[PDB]
């Protein structure tokens, strides 16, 4: 969906659904993405440099449910706001010694 707010006032944005890196990116027409605002399993946090301390990522665990509260909104920080996780692991074997004589 979408929303329009008046410059100044807040917005809180919500994400439902083995959690690791969590994110909100935006994009406005014609700009490449921007990554706002991140979350570790641990609870903390990162922010981009244009946020300067008016929103807040948050988690609630037991939804899987992140919000981003942004206050003090401004016209530049108009966009398409998305929530983003990634999943990484490797396995391995157990090795196997090769010995070559010769």
């Known amino acids: 969906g979408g929303g329009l707010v008046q410059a100044g006032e807040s917005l809180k944005l919500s994400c439902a659904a083995?959690?690791?890196?969590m994110g909100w990116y935006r994009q406005a027409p014609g700009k490449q993405r921007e990554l706002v605002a991140t979350?570790?399993?641990?609870?903390?946090?990162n922010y981009a440099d244009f946020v300067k301390g008016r929103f807040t990522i948050s988690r609630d665990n037991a939804k899987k449910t992140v919000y981003l509260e942004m206050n003090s909104l401004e016209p530049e920080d108009t966009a398409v706001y998305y929530c983003?996780?990634?999943?990484?692991?490797?396995?391995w074997g157990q090795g196997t010694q090769v010995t070559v004589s010769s």
């Open positions: 983003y996780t990634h999943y990484f692991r490797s396995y």
């Open positions: 083995s959690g690791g890196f």
């Open positions: 979350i570790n399993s641990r609870g903390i946090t």
